[PDB]
mmCIF file of C-alpha atoms and ligand atoms in Angstrom:
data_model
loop_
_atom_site.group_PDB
_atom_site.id
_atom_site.type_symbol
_atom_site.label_atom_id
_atom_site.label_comp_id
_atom_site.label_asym_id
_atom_site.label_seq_id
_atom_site.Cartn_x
_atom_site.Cartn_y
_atom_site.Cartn_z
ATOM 1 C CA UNK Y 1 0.000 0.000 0.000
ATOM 2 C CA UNK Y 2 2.302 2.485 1.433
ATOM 3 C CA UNK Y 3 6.193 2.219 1.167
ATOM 4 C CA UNK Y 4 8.225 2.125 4.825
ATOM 5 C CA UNK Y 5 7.294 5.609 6.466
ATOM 6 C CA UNK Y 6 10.037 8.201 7.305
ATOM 7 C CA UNK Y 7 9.941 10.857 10.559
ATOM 8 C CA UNK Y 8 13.058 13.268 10.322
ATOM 9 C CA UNK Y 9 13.626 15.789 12.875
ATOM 10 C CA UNK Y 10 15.815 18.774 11.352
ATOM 11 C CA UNK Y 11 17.687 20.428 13.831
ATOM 12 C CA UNK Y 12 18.204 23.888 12.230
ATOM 13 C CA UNK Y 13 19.266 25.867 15.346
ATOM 14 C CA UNK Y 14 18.600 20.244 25.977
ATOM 15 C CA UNK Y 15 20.000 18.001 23.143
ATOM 16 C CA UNK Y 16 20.783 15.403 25.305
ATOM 17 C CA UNK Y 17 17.458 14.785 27.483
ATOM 18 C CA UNK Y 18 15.879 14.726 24.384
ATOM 19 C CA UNK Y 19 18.144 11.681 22.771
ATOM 20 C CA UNK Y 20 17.414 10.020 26.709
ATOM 21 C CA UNK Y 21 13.863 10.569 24.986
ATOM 22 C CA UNK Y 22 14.130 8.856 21.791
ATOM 23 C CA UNK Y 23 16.748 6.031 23.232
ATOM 24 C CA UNK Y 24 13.945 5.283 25.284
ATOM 25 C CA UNK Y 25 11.294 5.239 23.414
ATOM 26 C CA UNK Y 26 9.923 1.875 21.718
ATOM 27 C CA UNK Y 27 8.724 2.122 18.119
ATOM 28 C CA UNK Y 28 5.733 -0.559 17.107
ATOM 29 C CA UNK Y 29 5.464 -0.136 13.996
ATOM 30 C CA UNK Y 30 7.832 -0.082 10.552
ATOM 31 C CA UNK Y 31 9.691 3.514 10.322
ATOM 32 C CA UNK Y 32 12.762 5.226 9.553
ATOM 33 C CA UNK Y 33 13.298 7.907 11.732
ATOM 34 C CA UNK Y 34 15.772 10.201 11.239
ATOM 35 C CA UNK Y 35 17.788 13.311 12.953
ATOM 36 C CA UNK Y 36 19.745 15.761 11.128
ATOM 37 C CA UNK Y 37 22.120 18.130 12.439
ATOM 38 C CA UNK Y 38 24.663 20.895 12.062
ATOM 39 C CA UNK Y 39 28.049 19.898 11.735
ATOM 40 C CA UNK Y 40 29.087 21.017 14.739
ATOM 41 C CA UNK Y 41 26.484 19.042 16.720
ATOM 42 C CA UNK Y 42 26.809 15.700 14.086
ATOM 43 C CA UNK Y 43 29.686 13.858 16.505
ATOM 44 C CA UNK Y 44 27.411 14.492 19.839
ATOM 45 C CA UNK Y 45 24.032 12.860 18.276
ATOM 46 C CA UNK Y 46 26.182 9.892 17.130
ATOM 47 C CA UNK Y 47 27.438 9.711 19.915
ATOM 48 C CA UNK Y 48 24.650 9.760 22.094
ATOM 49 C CA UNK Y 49 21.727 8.260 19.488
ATOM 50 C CA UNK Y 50 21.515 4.509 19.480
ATOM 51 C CA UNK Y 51 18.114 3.469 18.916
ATOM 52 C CA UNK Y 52 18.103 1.477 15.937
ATOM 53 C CA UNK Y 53 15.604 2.429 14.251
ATOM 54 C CA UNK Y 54 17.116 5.840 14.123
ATOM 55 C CA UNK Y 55 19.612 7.323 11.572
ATOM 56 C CA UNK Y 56 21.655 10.539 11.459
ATOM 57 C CA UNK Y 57 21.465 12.638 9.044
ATOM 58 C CA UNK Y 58 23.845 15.621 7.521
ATOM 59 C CA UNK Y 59 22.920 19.324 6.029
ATOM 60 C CA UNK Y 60 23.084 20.883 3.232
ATOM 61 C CA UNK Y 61 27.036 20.125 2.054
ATOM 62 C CA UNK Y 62 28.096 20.436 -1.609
ATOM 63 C CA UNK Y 63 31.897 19.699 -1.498
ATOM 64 C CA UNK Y 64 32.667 16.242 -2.678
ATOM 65 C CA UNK Y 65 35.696 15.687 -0.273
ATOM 66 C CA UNK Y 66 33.267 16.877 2.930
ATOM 67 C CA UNK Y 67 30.728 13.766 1.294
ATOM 68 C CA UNK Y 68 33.503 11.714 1.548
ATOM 69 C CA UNK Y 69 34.369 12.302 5.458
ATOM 70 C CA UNK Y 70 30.370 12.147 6.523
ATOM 71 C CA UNK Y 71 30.489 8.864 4.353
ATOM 72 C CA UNK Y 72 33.748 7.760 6.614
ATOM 73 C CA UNK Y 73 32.087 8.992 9.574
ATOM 74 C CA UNK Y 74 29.154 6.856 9.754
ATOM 75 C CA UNK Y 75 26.842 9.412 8.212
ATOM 76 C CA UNK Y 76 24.619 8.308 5.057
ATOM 77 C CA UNK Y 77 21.865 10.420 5.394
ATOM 78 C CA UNK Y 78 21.456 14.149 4.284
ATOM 79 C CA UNK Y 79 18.905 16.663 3.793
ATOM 80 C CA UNK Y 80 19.297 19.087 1.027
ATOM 81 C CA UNK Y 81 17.239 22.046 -0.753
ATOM 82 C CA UNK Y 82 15.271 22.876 2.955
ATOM 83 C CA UNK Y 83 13.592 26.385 2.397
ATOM 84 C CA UNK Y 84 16.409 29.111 4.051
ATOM 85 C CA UNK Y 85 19.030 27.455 1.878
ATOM 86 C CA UNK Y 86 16.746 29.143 -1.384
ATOM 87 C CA UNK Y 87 15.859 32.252 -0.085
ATOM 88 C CA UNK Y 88 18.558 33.133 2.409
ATOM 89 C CA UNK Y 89 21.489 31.568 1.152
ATOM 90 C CA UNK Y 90 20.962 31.446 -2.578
ATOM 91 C CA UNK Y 91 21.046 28.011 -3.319
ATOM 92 C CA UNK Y 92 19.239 27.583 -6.986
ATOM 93 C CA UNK Y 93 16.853 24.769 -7.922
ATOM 94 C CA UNK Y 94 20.103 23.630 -10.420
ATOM 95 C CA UNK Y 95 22.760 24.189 -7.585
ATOM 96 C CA UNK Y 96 20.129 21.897 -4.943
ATOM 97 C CA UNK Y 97 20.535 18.966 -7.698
ATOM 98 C CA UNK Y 98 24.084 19.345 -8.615
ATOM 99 C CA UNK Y 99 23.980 18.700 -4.327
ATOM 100 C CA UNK Y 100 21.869 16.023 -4.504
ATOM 101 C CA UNK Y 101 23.220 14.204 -7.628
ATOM 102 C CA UNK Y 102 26.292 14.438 -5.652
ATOM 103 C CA UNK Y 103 25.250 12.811 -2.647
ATOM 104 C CA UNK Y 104 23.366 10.007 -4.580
ATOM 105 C CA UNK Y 105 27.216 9.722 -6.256
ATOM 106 C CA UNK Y 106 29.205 9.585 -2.837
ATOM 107 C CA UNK Y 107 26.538 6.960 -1.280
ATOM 108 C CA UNK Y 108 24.051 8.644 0.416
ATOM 109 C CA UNK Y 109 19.972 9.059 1.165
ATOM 110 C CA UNK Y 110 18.782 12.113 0.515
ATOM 111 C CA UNK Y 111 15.732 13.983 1.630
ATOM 112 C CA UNK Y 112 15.204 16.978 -1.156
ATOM 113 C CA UNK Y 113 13.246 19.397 -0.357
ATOM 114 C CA UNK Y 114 10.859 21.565 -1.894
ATOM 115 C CA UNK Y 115 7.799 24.278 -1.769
ATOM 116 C CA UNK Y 116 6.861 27.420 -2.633
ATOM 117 C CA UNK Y 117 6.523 30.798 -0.722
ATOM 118 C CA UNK Y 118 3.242 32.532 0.314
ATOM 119 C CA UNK Y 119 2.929 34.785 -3.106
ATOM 120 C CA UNK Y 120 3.736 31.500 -5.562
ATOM 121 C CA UNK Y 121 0.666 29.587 -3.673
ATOM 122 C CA UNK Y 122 -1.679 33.087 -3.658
ATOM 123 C CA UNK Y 123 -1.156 33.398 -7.510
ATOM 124 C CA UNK Y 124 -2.038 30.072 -8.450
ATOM 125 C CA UNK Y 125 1.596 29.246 -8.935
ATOM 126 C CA UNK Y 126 2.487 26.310 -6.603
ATOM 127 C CA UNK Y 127 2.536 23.360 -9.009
ATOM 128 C CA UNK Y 128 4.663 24.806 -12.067
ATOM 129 C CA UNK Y 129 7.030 26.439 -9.010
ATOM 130 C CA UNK Y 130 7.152 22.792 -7.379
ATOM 131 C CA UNK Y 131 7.494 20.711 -10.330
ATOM 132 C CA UNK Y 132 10.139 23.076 -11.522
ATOM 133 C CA UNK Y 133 11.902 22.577 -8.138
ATOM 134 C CA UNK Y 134 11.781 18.668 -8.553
ATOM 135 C CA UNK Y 135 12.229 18.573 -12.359
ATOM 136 C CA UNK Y 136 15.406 20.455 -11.654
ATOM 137 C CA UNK Y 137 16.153 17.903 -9.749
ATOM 138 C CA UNK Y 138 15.887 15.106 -11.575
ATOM 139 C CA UNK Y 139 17.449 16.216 -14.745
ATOM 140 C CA UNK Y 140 21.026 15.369 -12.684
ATOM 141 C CA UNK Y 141 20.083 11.515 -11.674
ATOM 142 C CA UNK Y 142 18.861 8.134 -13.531
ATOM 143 C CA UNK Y 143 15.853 6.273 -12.730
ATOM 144 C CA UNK Y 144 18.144 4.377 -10.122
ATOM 145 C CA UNK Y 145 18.756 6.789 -8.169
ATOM 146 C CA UNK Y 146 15.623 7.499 -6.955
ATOM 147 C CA UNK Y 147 15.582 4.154 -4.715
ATOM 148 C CA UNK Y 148 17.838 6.670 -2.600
ATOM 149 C CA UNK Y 149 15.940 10.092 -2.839
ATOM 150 C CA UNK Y 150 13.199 11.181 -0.482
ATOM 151 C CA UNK Y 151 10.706 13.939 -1.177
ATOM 152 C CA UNK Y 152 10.092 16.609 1.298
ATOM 153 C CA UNK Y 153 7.436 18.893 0.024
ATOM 154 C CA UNK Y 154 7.901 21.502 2.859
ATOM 155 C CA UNK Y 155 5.490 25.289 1.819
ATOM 156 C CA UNK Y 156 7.918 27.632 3.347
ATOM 157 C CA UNK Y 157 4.616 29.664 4.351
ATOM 158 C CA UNK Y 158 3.608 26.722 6.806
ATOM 159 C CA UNK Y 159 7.632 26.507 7.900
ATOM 160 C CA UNK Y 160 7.790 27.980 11.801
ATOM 161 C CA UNK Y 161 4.642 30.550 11.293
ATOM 162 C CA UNK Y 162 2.591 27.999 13.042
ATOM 163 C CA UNK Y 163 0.251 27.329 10.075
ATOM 164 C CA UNK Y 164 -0.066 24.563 9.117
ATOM 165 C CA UNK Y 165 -1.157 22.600 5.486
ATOM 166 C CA UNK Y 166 -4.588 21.221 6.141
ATOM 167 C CA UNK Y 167 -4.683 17.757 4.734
ATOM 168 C CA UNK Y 168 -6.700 18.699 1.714
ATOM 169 C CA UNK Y 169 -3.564 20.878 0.907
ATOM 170 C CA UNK Y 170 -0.532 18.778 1.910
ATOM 171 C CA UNK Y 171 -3.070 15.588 0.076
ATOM 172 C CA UNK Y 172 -3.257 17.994 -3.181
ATOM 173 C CA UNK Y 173 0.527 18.439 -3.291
ATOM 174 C CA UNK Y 174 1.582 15.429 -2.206
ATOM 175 C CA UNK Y 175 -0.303 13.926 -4.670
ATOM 176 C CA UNK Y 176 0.820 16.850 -7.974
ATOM 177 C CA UNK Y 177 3.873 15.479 -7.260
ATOM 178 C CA UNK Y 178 3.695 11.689 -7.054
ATOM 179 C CA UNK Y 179 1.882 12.368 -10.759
ATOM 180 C CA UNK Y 180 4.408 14.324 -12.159
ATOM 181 C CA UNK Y 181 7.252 11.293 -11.176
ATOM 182 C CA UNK Y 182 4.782 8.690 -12.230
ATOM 183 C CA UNK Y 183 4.454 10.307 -15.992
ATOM 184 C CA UNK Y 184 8.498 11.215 -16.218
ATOM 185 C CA UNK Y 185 10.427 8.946 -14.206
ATOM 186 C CA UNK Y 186 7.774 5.651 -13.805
ATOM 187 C CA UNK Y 187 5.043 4.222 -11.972
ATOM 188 C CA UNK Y 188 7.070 1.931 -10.299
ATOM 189 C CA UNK Y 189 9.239 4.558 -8.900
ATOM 190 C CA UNK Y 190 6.068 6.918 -7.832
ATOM 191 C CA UNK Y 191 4.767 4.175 -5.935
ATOM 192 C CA UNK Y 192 8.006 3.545 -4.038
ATOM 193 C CA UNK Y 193 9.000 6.876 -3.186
ATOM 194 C CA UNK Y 194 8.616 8.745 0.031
ATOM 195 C CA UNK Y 195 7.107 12.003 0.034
ATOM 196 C CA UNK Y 196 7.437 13.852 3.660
ATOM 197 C CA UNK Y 197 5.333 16.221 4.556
ATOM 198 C CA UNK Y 198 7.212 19.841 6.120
ATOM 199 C CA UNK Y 199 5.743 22.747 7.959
ATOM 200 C CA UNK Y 200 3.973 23.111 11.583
ATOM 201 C CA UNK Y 201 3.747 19.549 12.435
ATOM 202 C CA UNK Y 202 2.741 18.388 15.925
ATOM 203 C CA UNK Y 203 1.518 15.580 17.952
ATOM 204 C CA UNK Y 204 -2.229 16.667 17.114
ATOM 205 C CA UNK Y 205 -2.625 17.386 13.659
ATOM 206 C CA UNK Y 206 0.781 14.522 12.327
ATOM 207 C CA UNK Y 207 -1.928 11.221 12.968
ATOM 208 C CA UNK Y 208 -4.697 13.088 10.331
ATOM 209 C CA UNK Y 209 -1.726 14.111 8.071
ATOM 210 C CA UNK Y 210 -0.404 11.162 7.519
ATOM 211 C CA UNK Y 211 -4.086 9.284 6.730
ATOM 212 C CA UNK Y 212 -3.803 11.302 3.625
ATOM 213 C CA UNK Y 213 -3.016 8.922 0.248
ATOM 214 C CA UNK Y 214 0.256 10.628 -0.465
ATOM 215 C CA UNK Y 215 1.856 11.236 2.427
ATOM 216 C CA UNK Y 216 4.570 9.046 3.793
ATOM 217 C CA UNK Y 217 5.644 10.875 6.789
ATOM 218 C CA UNK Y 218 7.071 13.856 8.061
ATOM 219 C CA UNK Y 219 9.930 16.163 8.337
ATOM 220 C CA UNK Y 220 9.568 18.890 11.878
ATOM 221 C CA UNK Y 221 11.603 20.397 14.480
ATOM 222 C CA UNK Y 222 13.906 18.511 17.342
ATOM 223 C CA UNK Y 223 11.705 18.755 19.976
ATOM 224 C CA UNK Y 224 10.312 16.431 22.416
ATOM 225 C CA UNK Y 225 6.946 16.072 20.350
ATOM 226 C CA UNK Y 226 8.769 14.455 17.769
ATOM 227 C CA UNK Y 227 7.693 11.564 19.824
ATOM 228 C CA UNK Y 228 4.297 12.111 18.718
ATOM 229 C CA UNK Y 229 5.477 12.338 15.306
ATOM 230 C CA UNK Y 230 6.691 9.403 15.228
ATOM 231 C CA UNK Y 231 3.913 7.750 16.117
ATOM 232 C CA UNK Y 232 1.369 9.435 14.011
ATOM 233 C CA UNK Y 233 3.241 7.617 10.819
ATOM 234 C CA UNK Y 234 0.594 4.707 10.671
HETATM 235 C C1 BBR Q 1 11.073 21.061 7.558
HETATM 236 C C2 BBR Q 1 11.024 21.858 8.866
HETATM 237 O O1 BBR Q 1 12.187 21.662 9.650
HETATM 238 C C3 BBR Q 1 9.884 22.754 9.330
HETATM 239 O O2 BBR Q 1 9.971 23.392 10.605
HETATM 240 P P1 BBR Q 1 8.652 23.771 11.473
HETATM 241 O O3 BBR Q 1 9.130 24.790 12.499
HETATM 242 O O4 BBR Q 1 7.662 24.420 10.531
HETATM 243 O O5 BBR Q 1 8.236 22.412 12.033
#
C-alpha cells in the first residue's frame, strides 16, 4: 500500500534529554526515523543516538571531499534544498541537484526538499514552481537513483509561522507530485517513493496528516513532540 514511512527531525538551530527521549522510546510499527544536524552538533548525536531504528542525518554540504568524510564517519543520510538554503542563502533549484546528484554519487539518502513561498501559492503558482523545483532535480540523476531520494514537500509559508497545510492541501501536493514522477520517471518509482510532509507539524494534527493517500511521513523540528510524530506515521 504504502512504502516504509520516514519521521526526520531537522535540527536547524537540551540536546541530550531529548536523545534520553528517543533512546527510550519503543517504536511498534515499521519507520525510519531520522535526525539531522549541524556539523558542529553531528559527533554528539552519534554519539549519544543509538536506537536502531534511528539514523543521522547531515545538512546541506556540496563539497565532494566533505561527502567523503560524513560517508567515513558513519553518516549516510542528508537533507538538502530545505527552504532558508533558497531564499537566504541562494542556493538555486540547479545548484540543490548538482547537491543532490552528488550525494546520490558519494553513497548517500537524501531527503530533497521543496515548496513554494506565500505569493507563488496566492497566484495560483504552486505546481509549475514545485514541479520546476523537482524537475530540476531530476534532470542530474537516472531512474536508479531514486531508490535513494526522499521527497520533502515543505510550503515555506507553513515553515515555523505555526500554520499549518490542512490535509486537503498537503493531500493535493503530495499527490501533484507523485503524478508528475509517475508520468516522467515511472510508476514503479512513484509508488516507491517517500514524500514527507514539512511545515507546523505536531503531535495533534501529524496522525490526520499522515491518513492522507500521499503522504509518507514527516519532516519537523527537534523537539520532544517528535515523539508524537513518530507515532502518528501509521
Ligand atoms: C522542515 C522543517 O524543519 C519545518 O519546521 P517547522 O518549524 O515548521 O516544524
Amino acid at each position: 500500500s504504502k512504502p516504509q514511512p520516514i519521521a526526520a527531525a531537522n535540527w536547524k538551530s537540551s540536546l541530550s534529554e531529548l536523545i534520553d527521549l528517543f533512546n527510550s522510546t519503543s517504536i511498534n510499527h515499521d519507520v525510519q526515523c531520522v535526525v539531522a544536524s549541524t556539523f558542529v552538533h553531528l559527533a554528539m548525536t552519534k554519539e549519544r543516538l543509538s536506537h536502531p531504528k534511528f539514523v543521522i542525518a547531515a545538512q546541506n554540504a556540496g563539497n565532494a571531499d566533505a561527502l567523503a568524510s560524513l560517508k567515513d564517519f558513519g553518516v549516510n543520510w542528508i537533507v538538502l534544498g530545505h527552504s532558508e538554503r533558497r531564499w537566504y542563502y541562494g542556493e538555486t533549484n540547479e545548484i540543490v541537484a548538482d547537491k543532490v546528484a552528488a550525494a546520490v554519487a558519494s553513497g548517500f539518502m537524501v531527503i530533497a526538499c521543496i515548496g513554494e513561498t506565500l505569493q507563488e501559492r496566492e497566484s495560483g503558482r504552486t505546481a509549475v514552481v514545485v514541479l520546476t523545483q523537482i524537475a530540476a532535480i531530476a534532470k542530474k540523476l537516472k531512474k536508479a537513483d531514486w531508490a535513494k531520494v526522499v521527497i520533502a514537500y515543505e510550503p515555506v509559508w507553513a515553515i515555523g509561522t505555526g500554520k499549518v497545510a490542512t490535509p486537503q492541501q498537503a493531500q493535493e501536493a503530495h499527490a501533484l507530485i507523485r503524478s508528475w514522477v509517475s508520468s516522467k520517471i515511472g510508476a514503479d518509482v512513484a509508488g516507491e517513493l517517500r514524500i514527507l510532509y514539512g511545515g507546523s507539524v505536531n503531535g495533534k494534527n501529524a496522525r490526520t496528516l499522515y491518513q492522507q493517500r500521499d503522504v509518507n511521513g514527516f519532516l519537523a523540528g527537534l523537539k520532544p513532540e517528535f515523539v508524537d510524530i513518530i507515532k502518528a506515521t501509521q
